[PDB]
Amino acid sequence: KNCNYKRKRRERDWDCNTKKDVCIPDRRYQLCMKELTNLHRDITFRKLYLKRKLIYDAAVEGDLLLKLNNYRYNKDFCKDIRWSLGDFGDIIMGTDMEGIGYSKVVENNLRSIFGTASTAATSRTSWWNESKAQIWTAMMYSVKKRLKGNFIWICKLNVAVNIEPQIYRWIREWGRDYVSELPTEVQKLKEKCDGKINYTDKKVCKVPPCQNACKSYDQWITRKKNQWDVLSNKFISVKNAEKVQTAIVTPYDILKQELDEFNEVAFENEINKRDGAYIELCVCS
């Protein structure tokens, strides 16, 4: 059904339990791969066949993402295009980090086509780099259909096709989720735990629904911290898999680039529950 409609963003939080070395976004789980899953001639013909199947899945993915975006054509939509396109790329290149269920089937199908010799990985990257512009076009079809020649400037093609390791992109995506969730969770804390100027005891000291709001906030921030540690640890593993090391980029550098107002110290305080706002609202001491 993931090729029929998308869950609301953040309806399901990042999943770190299924594959323990990485946290997987719901968007990735829902990536449309129907045609890719449902995959004799020369290998050249079969690659051509693959392209067309990838175009179909990409077109559907872009259509459902736009519907999820309620046809707004805003930054959220363009990010989703970039994330999903990127994931398609990693699937094609064989560097996707999910590799469960039908993703495993898809990887088997691609290996039937490209083989598994020592040149396979390179030729798979070559095929993607040669094809990715058309896949973006396929993903943007639903936009082209409604906006015609003006679809070109809704989202940036170049940004979308520029190759980046999957864990880089997922950290960007995760960060955008975090900054969307944070004020929302702080709202709930404030509403239940906010105090008048002349209070004597914090509400959290003895007021049950404030305590339960703090408990619930604790559960959320504990997930966020867990997710950040897992993704950060995966960032290190993926980096160390690179034969040559770039002499340094950290996950915070990525967050700093993706996010508007990022502040590493503030961020680290929040996920460790030692920020001023949390302490004010949830620590009775």
Author numbering: 2 to 40, 49 to 256, 258 to 295
Manuscript text:
P. vivax Duffy Binding Protein (DBP) is a surface protein that the parasite uses to invade host red blood cells and is a leading vaccine candidate. DBP is a member of the Duffy binding-like erythrocyte binding protein (DBL-EBP) family, and binds DARC through a conserved cysteine-rich DBL domain known as region II (DBP-II). DBP-II engages DARC through a multimeric assembly mechanism where two DBP-II domains initially bind one DARC to form a heterotrimer that rapidly recruits a second DARC to form a heterotetramer. Consistent with this view, the most polymorphic region, identified as the DEK epitope, is positioned immediately adjacent to the conserved DARC-binding groove.
To overcome this inherent deficiency of DBP as an immunogen, a novel synthetic DBP-II antigen termed DEKnull was engineered where the polymorphic residues that comprise the DEK epitope were mutated to amino acids not usually present. We obtained the crystal structure of the DEKnull antigen to a resolution of 2.1 Å. DEKnull maintains the overall fold and conserved disulfide bonding patterns of a DBL domain similar to that found in P. vivax DBP Sal1, from which DEKnull is derived. DEKnull also retains the characteristic three sub-domain architecture of DBL domains with critical intra-domain disulfide bonding patterns. All cysteines in DEKnull are involved in disulfide bonding and are structurally conserved with Sal1 DBP-II. Alignment of DEKnull and Sal1 DBP-II structures shows minimal differences with an overall root-mean-square (r.m.s.) deviation of 0.435 Å, indicating there is minimal differences overall between the native and engineered domains. S2 alignment has a r.m.s. deviation of 0.288 Å, and the only change is the region comprising K366 to I376, which is now structured in DEKnull as compared to Sal1 DBP-II. Strikingly, the DEKAQQRRKQ polymorphic stretch within S2 overlaps well between DEKnull and Sal1 DBP-II. Alteration of these amino acids to ASTAATSRTS had no affect on the secondary structure nor do they shift peptide backbone Cαs. The dimerization and DARC binding surfaces overlap well with the parental Sal1 DBP-II; there is no allosteric change to secondary structure or peptide backbone Cαs, retaining the conformational shape of protective targets.
